[PDB]
């Protein structure tokens, strides 16, 4: 059986919480006015939902508005947003409103006037890298520090109105409450910012799952490689990893957890040495480089969740300087 686990900070937020911050299936919803809200366009889709833009009528205010395709997990997800309302870089949650005939559930946001990241990232500089990547972590020390992991962290859900340097962790669909000794649902995150601990499949996991997503997010900015570990399926997600990371590390943390790795690793995986991070910088990407980013970045992506920084511990180190 596998070695157990608990987060190294914020572990018992929940537990000293009261029974209603944490027990979504008992929160009663408050619906608002469907008739407030006018649909614009189409913004995208998810496999639970559709998003829109859309406009509140009674103060001419661009909103966003995804409309629900299971009752538990939209619980979660408002409760989730509700408890999380006013952090730092949180999307607000402005409105939860149902179509009064049909049922049909759908969650008002504020809108962001966000700007494609495949557009985006090309034109940021060292500094806004920096500026971004705090801002990312205030959010993500504050939904840890109300016992919430968000488990989607990743570019297309990092809302920036650029011109407003303006900063937004959205889509908390996937978010989940941090109690100690849960077993999680690995089948969380998008491929590219998994976490080892997902893809070997070890379910104990904690809040340090969004700081190796974060750490992904990091390569891909300062080394200008979107993603920046791009494997095909599942299994080469975590063979991208250890041509990085090198193999040693990967075995380490698989026998320090008593992880028993799928038949399918041992082939694929290899053999390879850990590579030095200044291998990825080039004349192109140099600009975002310096050793303040590749010694931050090496302490997000570690394949140990107990080793990875917390996202306080990176707001403090020299990287932000120039910010804080
Ligand atoms: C709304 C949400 O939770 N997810 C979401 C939002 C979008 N797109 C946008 C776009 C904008 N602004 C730009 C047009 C200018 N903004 N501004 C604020 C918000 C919010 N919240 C927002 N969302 C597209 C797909 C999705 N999902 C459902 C796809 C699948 N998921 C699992 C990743
Ligand atoms: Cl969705
Ligand atoms: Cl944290």
């Known amino acids: 059986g596998p070695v157990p686990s608990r987060a190294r900070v914020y572990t018992d937020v929940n537990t000293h919480r009261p029974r209603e911050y944490w027990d979504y299936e ?76 049909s049922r049909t559930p759908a969650l008002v946001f504020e809108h962001v006037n966000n700007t494609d990241f495949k557009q985006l990232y090309q034109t940021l500089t060292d500094y806004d890298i920096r500026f971004y990547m705090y801002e990312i972590l205030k959010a993500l020390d504050y939904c ?34 941090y109690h100690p000794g849960q077993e999680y649902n690995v089948r969380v995150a998008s491929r590219y910012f998994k976490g080892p601990e997902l893809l070997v499949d070890y379910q104990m996991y904690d809040y340090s799952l969004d700081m190796w997503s974060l750490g992904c997010m990091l390569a891909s900015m300062i080394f200008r490689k979107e993603p920046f570990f791009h494997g095909h399926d599942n299994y080469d997600q975590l063979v991208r990893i250890a041509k990085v990371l090198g193999t040693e590390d990967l075995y380490d943390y698989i026998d320090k957890y008593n992880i028993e790795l799928d038949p399918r690793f041992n082939d694929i995986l290899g053999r390879h040495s850990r590579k030095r991070w200044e291998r990825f910088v080039h004349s192109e990407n140099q600009h975002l480089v310096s050793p303040e980013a590749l010694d931050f970045l090496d302490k997000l992506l570690r394949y140990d969740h107990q080793s990875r920084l917390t996202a306080r511990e990176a707001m403090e180190h020299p990287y932000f300087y120039t910010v804080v």
């Open 26 to 101: 008992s929160h009663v919803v408050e619906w608002g006015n469907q008739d407030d809200y006018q649909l614009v366009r189409k913004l995208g889709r998810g496999k639970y939902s559709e998003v829109f833009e859309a406009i509140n009528i009674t103060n001419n205010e661009k909103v966003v508005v995804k409309i629900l395709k299971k009752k538990k997990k939209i619980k979660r997800e408002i409760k989730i947003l509700e408890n999380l309302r006013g952090g730092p870089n949180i999307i607000t949650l402005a409105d939860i409103v149902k179509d009064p005939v």
């Open 144 to 177: 840890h520090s109300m016992g919430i992991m968000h488990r989607d962290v990743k570019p297309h859900n990092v809302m920036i109105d650029h011109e407003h340097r303006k900063l937004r962790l959205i889509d908390w669909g996937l978010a989940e409450f």
